[PDB]
């Protein structure tokens, strides 16, 4: 398989970032793409070991292929124009390419705009329970930047995948503003009898990808680090 | 250099119907590929085409690229929810210098809408589990004919139709969320800028 490291990353303008790619098939060809909302654009591609040639958009990037199984992509001086979802690829015999899971990279002019999400769970309405004999819980995560969030539902320790409906794309809170904070919505629908049981524990988890332990904070608020903000709710019988 | 024109950019087809994406080029391509990138995942090869004019089919999928070696299409039959994602066409760069590389199109983002057989459209108000002061509005149980639009109020947030969980489609329903901090915010007039079913249940807290 192909692995990519890291999966989520936040950096600043002028910083040096390296994205890692690995493969276990010993494929000779390897590729590095960026997927800006222009399609898949080739940055660099390596025919074999120590063979590196430029692609369609090589400006601002540097690669190396000292060994076959690795193809690191380096941003020399990160710019806001290099904010993208980066996909690594490899291929044995052309043309079929195998892609990694992708790296979501966000370059910022400053880390004063990164914020963790505020998560809240909203209990179903008795009107819905009386009308449809169902109970929809709504999870709301607001005020986070960037949109490196993963929402999941937790019910009594197991993972709820039935009756779950999460937003496809986050919602810019101030769409006219640049680098505006985001909001994410989600829903979980259970039977009316399942919600009326008070022992059932509902918890909405939002995995936020923020700052690493190797970053610093000169401001006063808690350093927006990679963390998990969760909201809970228990099923009232009335 | 070589360019692959993929159309249409978006496709919102409903569950069970057919899918059709085209892919045209100004130059010839000896090999045409199709990829499917599911949300949050990477692109995976869908079908490889090595013979011109050969109608290949792996059950639900059907693809072909013409004898002119400049066009290609992809057809998905009986749309199921897991077909949501981006679809790229690719062609191996003709020549040896650019060989190994492949030119991709812009891609078509596909969305599959559920078939709600028994619609019961209603707008409910849900209270927060911590501060009973805050609440959200829940428009739900409307069929795919109803389209939810944003709000003209800058301080009102509107959520479009959500993509359901591909793992399990149990309790498959359409839903939209609205909330705001304005004291003039009431769920009865939250979705006022959208066309809503006339027989929409509007209960009270």
Residue numbers in the entry:
A (entry chain H): 3 to 29, 37 to 46, 48 to 58, 63 to 72, 74 to 81, 83 to 254
B (entry chain G): 1 to 29, 37 to 59, 63 to 68, 74 to 220
The study reports:
CD4+ T cell autoreactivity against citrullinated (cit) self-epitopes presented by HLA-DRB1 is associated with rheumatoid arthritis (RA) pathogenesis. Here, we examined TNC1014,1016cit peptide, which contains citrullination at position P-1 and P2, to study the underlying TCR-HLA-DRB1∗04:01-TNC1014,1016cit molecular interactions. The TRAV35+/TRBV10-2+ PB TCR was previously isolated from peripheral blood mononuclear cells (PBMC) of patient with RA. We show specific binding to double citrullinated TNC1014,1016cit peptide presented by HLA-DRB1∗04:01, and the citrullines play a critical role in determining PB TCR recognition.
To understand whether this secondary structure transition of the CDR3α loop is ligand driven, we also determined the structure of the apo form of PB TCR at 2.75 Å resolution. Superposition of PB TCR-HLA-DRB1∗04:01TNC1014,1016cit holo and PB TCR apo form at the Cα backbone of the TCR showed a very subtle change with a root mean square deviation (r.m.sd) value of 0.57 Å. In the PB TCR apo form, the CDR3α loop was unstructured, whereupon Asn111 and Thr112 were positioned downward. While in the PB TCR holo state, the 109VGNTN113 of the CDR3α loop reoriented with Val109 and Asn113 to point downward facing HLA-DRB1∗04:01TNC1014,1016cit. Thus, the altered conformational transition of the CDR3α loop in the PB TCR-TNC1014,1016cit holo state is ligand driven.
